[PDB]
Amino acid sequence: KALKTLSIFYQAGTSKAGNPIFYYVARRFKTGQINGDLLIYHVLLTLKPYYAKPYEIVVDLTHTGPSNRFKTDFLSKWFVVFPGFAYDNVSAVYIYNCNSWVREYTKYHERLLTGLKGSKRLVFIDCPGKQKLPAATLALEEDLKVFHNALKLAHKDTKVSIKVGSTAVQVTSAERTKVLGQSVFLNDIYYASEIEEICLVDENQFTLTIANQGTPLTFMHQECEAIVQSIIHIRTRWELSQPD
Ligand SMILES: [Mg+2]
């Protein structure tokens, strides 16, 4: 009932600047499955012996989606449950593996997150170099087929790379996009278990419907056939490994 909530947030290491570092692993928190107040209380007790002095936070957003989200009314609680100095004493916030969903999440909540907008303390890490299946770590360490110069079609199209592993698919933005007032790179991660549909529209276009996420993704690339075919391959390999 408890330990299940310590992997989400914990203290570990000391910043190069000599400050205590804390990690929030976003994908550990499942809204509805984990009591909100329990998590806050955990976080508070963990920060209590430190947050009177400068400290640093590492937000881990890899594979963060709707199920990892804070409901609006729960998000608000975080803005008033800590003493004032606790917010001020945060000297740095390193954001890791921010993705398309988080961007929409922060835009939807932009009026609440005004304080973070274009903040000097928020550092978006633009490259990773700085019985339960890991999945996330396996996906980021397995061999890949990389399709560069792809095009993600949206309100404004964006250069992206499409990386197909054996268990997951990554779409990495090749050009910066606006997030909380900053130009950053995004890295989406879709487990083969999340690809509900994958339709090949033409020789160099295709769509990708992600489970639990409304609007299907649309891409363009010279070798859309090979891309679509390899993704279908891993989706199949996953379905075959599921219990009958
Ligand atoms: Mg999800």
Coordinates of N, CA and C in Angstrom, one line a residue, residues 16 94-97 123-130 140:
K16 N 25.7 19.1 -9.1 CA 27.1 19.5 -9.4 C 27.3 20.8 -8.6
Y94 N 15.1 20.1 -13.9 CA 15.5 19.5 -15.1 C 14.4 18.6 -15.7
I95 N 13.8 18.9 -16.8 CA 12.8 18.2 -17.4 C 13.3 17.2 -18.5
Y96 N 13.0 15.9 -18.3 CA 13.6 14.9 -19.2 C 12.6 14.1 -20.0
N97 N 12.8 14.0 -21.3 CA 11.9 13.3 -22.2 C 10.5 13.8 -22.3
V123 N 14.8 23.8 -16.8 CA 15.8 23.4 -17.8 C 15.3 22.1 -18.6
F124 N 14.9 22.3 -19.8 CA 14.5 21.1 -20.6 C 15.8 20.4 -21.2
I125 N 16.0 19.2 -20.8 CA 17.1 18.4 -21.2 C 16.9 17.9 -22.7
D126 N 17.7 18.5 -23.6 CA 17.5 18.2 -25.0 C 18.1 17.0 -25.6
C127 N 18.8 16.2 -24.7 CA 19.4 14.9 -25.1 C 19.8 14.1 -23.9
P128 N 19.3 12.8 -23.9 CA 19.4 11.9 -22.7 C 20.8 11.8 -22.1
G129 N 21.8 12.2 -22.8 CA 23.2 12.2 -22.3 C 23.4 13.4 -21.4
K130 N 23.5 13.1 -20.1 CA 23.7 14.2 -19.1 C 24.8 13.8 -18.1
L140 N 14.4 2.0 -24.9 CA 15.4 3.0 -25.2 C 16.8 2.4 -25.3

